[PDB]
Input
Amino acid sequence: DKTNDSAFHARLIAEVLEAYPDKARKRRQKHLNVAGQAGVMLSECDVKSNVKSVPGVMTIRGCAYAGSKGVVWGPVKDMVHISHGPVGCGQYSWSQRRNYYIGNTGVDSFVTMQFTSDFQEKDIVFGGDKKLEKIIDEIDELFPLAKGISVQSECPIGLIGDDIEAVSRKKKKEIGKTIVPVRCEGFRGVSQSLGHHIANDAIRDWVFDGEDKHAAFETTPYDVNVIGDYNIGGDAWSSRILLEEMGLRVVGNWSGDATLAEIERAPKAKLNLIHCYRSMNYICRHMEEKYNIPWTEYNFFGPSQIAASLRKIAALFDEKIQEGAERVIAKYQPLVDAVIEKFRPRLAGKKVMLYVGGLRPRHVVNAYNDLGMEIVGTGYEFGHNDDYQRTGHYVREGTLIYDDVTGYELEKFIEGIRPDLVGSGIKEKYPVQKMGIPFRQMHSWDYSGPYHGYDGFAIFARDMDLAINNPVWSMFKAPW
Amino acid sequence: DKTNDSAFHARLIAEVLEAYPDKARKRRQKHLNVAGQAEGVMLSECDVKSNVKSVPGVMTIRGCAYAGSKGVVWGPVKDMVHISHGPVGCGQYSWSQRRNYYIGNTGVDSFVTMQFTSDFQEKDIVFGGDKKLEKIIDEIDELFPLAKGISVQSECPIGLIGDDIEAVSRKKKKEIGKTIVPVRCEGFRGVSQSLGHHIANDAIRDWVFDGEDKHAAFETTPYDVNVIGDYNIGGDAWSSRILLEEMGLRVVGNWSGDATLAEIERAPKAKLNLIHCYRSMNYICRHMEEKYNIPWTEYNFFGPSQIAASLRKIAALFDEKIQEGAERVIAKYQPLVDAVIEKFRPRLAGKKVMLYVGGLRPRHVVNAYNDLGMEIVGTGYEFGHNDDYQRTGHYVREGTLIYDDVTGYELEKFIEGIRPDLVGSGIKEKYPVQKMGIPFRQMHSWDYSGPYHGYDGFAIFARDMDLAINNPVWSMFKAPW
Amino acid sequence: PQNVDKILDHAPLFREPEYQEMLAGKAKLENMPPADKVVEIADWTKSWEYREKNFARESLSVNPAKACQPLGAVFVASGFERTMSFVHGSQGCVAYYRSHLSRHFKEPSSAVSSSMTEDAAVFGGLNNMVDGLANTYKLYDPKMIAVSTTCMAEVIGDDLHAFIQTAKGKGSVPEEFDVPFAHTPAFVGSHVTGYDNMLKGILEHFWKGRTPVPNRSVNIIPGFDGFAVGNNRELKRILGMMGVQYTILSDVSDQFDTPSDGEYRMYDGGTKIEAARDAVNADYTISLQEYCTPKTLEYCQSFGQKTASFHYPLGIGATDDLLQKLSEISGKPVPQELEMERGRLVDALADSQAYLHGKTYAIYGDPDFVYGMARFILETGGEPKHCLATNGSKAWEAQMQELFDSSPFGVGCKAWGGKDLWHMRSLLATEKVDLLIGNSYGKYLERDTDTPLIRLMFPIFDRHHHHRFPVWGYQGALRVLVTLLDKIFDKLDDDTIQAGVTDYSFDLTR
Amino acid sequence: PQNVDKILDHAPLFREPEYQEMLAGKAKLENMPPADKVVEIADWTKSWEYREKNFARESLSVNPAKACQPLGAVFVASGFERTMSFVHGSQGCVAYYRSHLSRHFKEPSSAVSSSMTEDAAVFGGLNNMVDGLANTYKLYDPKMIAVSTTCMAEVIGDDLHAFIQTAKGKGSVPEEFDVPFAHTPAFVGSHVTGYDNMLKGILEHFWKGRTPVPNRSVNIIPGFDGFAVGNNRELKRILGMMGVQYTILSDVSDQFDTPSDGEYRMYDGGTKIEAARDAVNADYTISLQEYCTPKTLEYCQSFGQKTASFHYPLGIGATDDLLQKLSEISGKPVPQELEMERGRLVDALADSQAYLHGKTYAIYGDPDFVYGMARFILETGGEPKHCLATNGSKAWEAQMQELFDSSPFGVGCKAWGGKDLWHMRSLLATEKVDLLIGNSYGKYLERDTDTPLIRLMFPIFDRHHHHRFPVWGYQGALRVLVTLLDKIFDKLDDDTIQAGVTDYSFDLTR
Ligand code: ICS
Ligand code: ICS
Ligand code: CLF
Ligand code: CLF
Ligand SMILES: [Fe+3]
Output
């Protein structure tokens, strides 16, 4: 019946560490911890991060191709993204990330499609550059509205010494459309993270590194880019409406619903609003050095954070934008109040465990708190030390923390804690439901959303309620 | 196995008669025969007794007078509400089952594919249903205000309990100013659907024609006809009408498929009645010749031989101009007829068909089967009269097996024995026949296809007979071990 | 025009220009209301003003969802070994009973009429019974003839017992030959009532004045069921796995699903005549549909049987309840293979519940179908907002209300007994729901109100072979579940298929 | 706006005026082509001119319908008792293989990576194998570890046999512990090839250098199957009724359909390790999918087994052929309950064939699915006009052509091997067909060309639990049949639901 949570979580860490052989145990012991004690820091999440996954342990991580093609590049709607290498990676990543966009797909946008070089054995032996050249021509003919092409390198490309940069230089001249070679082969790095850095540097080197090109663009003192909202279930649209209502102009949202033109213009803006710090702080740092554009972190999960974010951002401008913030916060109050009254009674006191990639494991916490729910465990697939640092702004002391958690560890922590909810990904969902524990996907939003912004908060609450407070759980135990 | 068909059919008659007790046998022996030599042109003589009581317990295929009246004649009239008056049964079973097609907003300006019923409870059987009917008519007036009229289709109890629906109809027509037609089509009357037709025709005469002429404003032409007795099965009357219009006629009304009450009301203003279904509606055509001096003529729009002969026969009743239109229509559609015949006659020629339908189709479709090289080796009517059997001899060859009000037993034994290539009958015959490994096409509902009337129909007709006979399913009946 | 390379049947054909022009020409002389008047009255029929009047109806039924007793009689009688339904009365009835069943099962339906005509109103129908029984027996070699009545034979008041004895006296059938009978008046209740009346009649025939030799077996009556073919097979599979000693009383599962192999089987399967006779010995009789059996269960009670009645058991809880009752009766535990099926159904429901939670439904049919369906809906987190049964009593409305109160997803929900589909139309128009669960007549409600239909109730005329698959059991519950989800997902793809306007939400994975 | 009583998620939400206005505003600065230009290029992409160029492609694949080998390896390895797939190579692969399977079955998919990083390119991947095998064995207590390879490990050239022996030398797993391995290079063939390669690898592990002790049993390999869960149960039911002595090699039917009952089962069911070992004794091995097993059948042939391969048997003839072969092998006749099922399927087809005759289809997927589906279509009088398999060889095209030639409904049908769904789009645009049979990626073809999709091929992502029901067998053929008819009726109701314009053809009975 009774427990101490900090000490119970430390026990669960010790239990799982006993299952490993000594070599794997030494590597894993520094990835698991209980949050200690330290705007404001609630707690310290001291855990090692961003290193090799241990072999054979059933890590949840993806590769750099995921981080580059799947995450950063694939959402850019008016480019064709070539999954360069064999058929696999582009099939599995085809239309699985719900980075929404407006377009005619196949005609003026190319997101929910697989374009691949479909490497055969002749391509591994004799190289694939001659094939890429032919491919680019074929794209130019059959998808003429594509304003550009990216070459997303899968594992073999770098291993066989193909020169995709030569090809990209050559064909950009030949067809007059931007070509972006990305060295996001899965063997690089340890996770999706390096795919982000590589992809960001590819934007810098093959999009920003060029002419003119929008000297005609009229600017305002209120121009921003939203950097790192990939429009999951329309998240960036429900973020943008609030920023516009506050009086800002969104030059470009990177990279959900983004066109190449929007990205190309990012240097003309006054300020970068970075939501996903992890995937895109790299380009924001470049944009502060080269152009003198400052960046700021915000968060649009739940009414506390949205209010704090609108105010923080507006304080960077003037009186007029500050007044708009308050007007937006005031406008949406009846909605916030209605959501809280409907759903907080149904969710307050409930315990949540989380596991996501590089941002959401901290960023959603405050929205769960706005509904009275506590986060008892969280963790990142590919967070860096600076993501764990920031996690302490959100989680209380005694929260179980796990970096690049293993299937074994995560199953044992969920069995032990029996939270009321788990928020993680597709590969975690079904086992957890089988254990009699509600689960909501915190990557795809379980095919729902948006969760960002105020229109999002309603849907977020509806979804956590419908998963927890559902008749299916009472029917797990057969009546005999 | 070699056979002589006339004698084989006579043997099958003898086989089935042996299964009956003596009393039923004596009644059934006069309903079964082989078409004799003949005593347009007569091909044979189909001498069989007809239009009498069905024998109890024999699995007759016949319906009742309510079918004939509500299901057949009245229910297709689109801008009337038809009350199935009595308990819930009859109007449920007959709800939307006859494909008497129409253009309308159903529930709003037309009421065909609906069941309106008085839903008789025991209190209604004991204390009478007239007070209920009165209330019903008010309720129809309120909730279906676009209904130009109401018919009261009497189910079995009404006449048995001495309800006076005619009093009610008189009373409420005055009260609401909309035609009300009480029909005494209770199922205990007659022996079949047939009497339902006569009763319904006489109800048209007595409660629609018997009134102040509603349309004195109607401009007439020398080329005005009514099409009488095409109920628009799968759009049959629409594909018939396009040909009659193209020939130069004006169709005042088509009875009763896609019909409005207005069209029926105006029938006396026409110059000529084109009767397709002789059986269901010759009664009103005879009335219309006595009272208004409007002559009638029989036509047939099943298959190109008949359509051509029909267009010509009809046009010969008018003048040079309409006769030239006939030839223009026949000429216009010849490439289509030629194309259908070239595609489908090779696939169907030499194949043997058995038929069983109600009162018209058992003869009327034969010539269209012959236009595709198919022969009719057995035919028969649920409720034909002597004059239908007379006319059957214009269509079937000597030696054709003929069966009136055939029984399930008899029909199964005849199909097992003859093993035709096709059977054309109704829903209650379909499935057993397919189970015997024999192709079947519904000759009432057209198996949810159609139209079959006219030239556009003939293509669809051929397609359908081909797709049922020439399909891979038959070769898979025998399992390979 | 028509064309032999791509033949146009009625649907595309009358959309061709020449027919559109000819139909416009015809319309000008039809004296139908003008198009502005049609729009006006259409909108009016979907209003609240109209709904109040439509619900104020006292006498007129429009589009009722029920048939009359003899249909239920023919149905139940068809589930006994080589049994022919003999409906004493007018013959048009029998053409209709048979056509109705055939259109649903896509199968033969055999039944005969005594063929009473007008003269029977003055002389009574004796000769029809005597002659009819004689001819039905000689021609169709039945082992049992099951007599029911059309409404004309009821009004006339023919004494069936006397008539049948007279028939035996005149040698129409052997003296010991089985001719159970029942009064099945169309003007009381509905088809479920005739199911009950005819079944009691059959049981009374074999049981009258006998003394049981008790055994621990259970008689199971499935009731009037559009899905009899798959359901009874699912039922038998379940009972087999459990090892229960049973007798199904009335099993049409083979009769309405005979093969197409070159032989036409007039009769196939059925409750054996001997098993019907030994069924009086069972200590228990359970009905799977209360409203199909009250008279029959009362009769079984008159031989000291204990009785239980369910409501068309659909889903987890209802199946659990049936299994528990079976287990209690048989003394046998639920076997592990059935716990697996159960656990797998739960798994399906948990995987898919995001799409079911909050969905709102209208449901109609026979009272037991509606109960069982509404209950299943509540398990999924759905709301059975408009439940309706034309043949549903006030006692039924109370039971439905108890069902609603058992779950928080019941709050809005009403049960409308004795209302019809024109009533339902006004409900769907004024209080929109996501989905309609009914029968083929419900397509007209789909057309009139843009409420998609799911067909889980007799009759299903415009789809083929759904009856071959179960809806009862854990397996059947999984079919129903997948049938709902499929309707929901089609609808989601249709909402999101328009390129550049709605296809932002056209997810590959759902 | 948003509203707590009727909450709008993404689909309806972004259709609200405020978002429509904001999205119009965003579009003005997007530099996307104007709407007239989009219409022009859209129509152009549906043209014949475009089709000639699209089919002139030599290097670019767009929307291929295939995965890479390791998916097939993971799949087949998952059908062995407590077996963990271990994919030696990079880990992003494993995330994807698992996600793909999970989204299809709505189930867990367990697999592990050796987690090779950049260093393994210079030093080779030995430590990853040794450490990986150690950790997988200790953590997940498998009975067998089945090693496959990602394309990086193939290019680097690691010697798997040596590495695995080294691993055993260092105590990572017990010396006698089962670690079968296979090269599964993504750049050869597809997922069906990895099924074959891994399966051979497993069999070779247990069979190498042994001498059979012959028995009359048959090994059955089902191959790569989106419907593995229902199909394998149908297969077993059939085999049980026939009384055939068999072993299924790779049965994922329990692994991808575990219950939700409070316990998570990492492993469940599977071919027993001992049965895989005794499978070398069988005189026969049959594959239900040729293209999943050629290497494996050759290996079985190397132990003197007689071998037969089918093409995803769907429908009457294909099932008949399988049953006959089973009967020839076992000596046992086909039992009467299976003739009944057969005769009942024939009955369904005969009842419903008016709606199937003349229908035209496009079909795509794995080569065997496409063969078997096309064949079933021909039984119904349908025309499999556009058959397509991205992973289909020329030898397959010849086999398809032989199938076409066997029936008059084959005239004009083509089999397009090594083409993709962008190719299929141009076929559907230029030569319209009634229906598309494929997988969830085909929804994009439904959108682009108004050709309704029927999902009978892996993966099915946007429908739930279809995999739980068979498509093989007579029972499965009936499901397929009903799935076609349902799509067809339904399209017919949608063509005829518009009141006063098209609803003349809205038949209650079909
Ligand atoms: S990009 Fe990143 S794993 Fe910042 S790779 Fe991943 S659409 Fe996650 S926690 Mo999938 S760093 Fe986005 C993410 Fe977060 S794909 Fe999405 S949900 S906010
Ligand atoms: S009316 Fe008659 S039984 Fe003449 S009652 Fe019957 S739509 Fe038949 S042979 Mo159904 S006298 Fe019409 C008929 Fe013929 S309903 Fe139809 S097909 S041409
Ligand atoms: S880390 Fe793509 S699935 Fe695997 S075997 Fe090669 S083709 Fe196939 Fe990342 S980049 Fe891709 S996803 Fe892996 S392979 Fe490397
Ligand atoms: S001959 Fe009489 S009019 Fe004809 S169809 Fe029969 S009842 Fe009706 Fe039967 S079906 Fe039932 S019992 Fe009465 S109500 Fe309607
Ligand atoms: Fe699951």
Remarks:
- The domain at 1-63+346-480 of chain A is CATH 3.40.50.1980 (Rossmann fold).
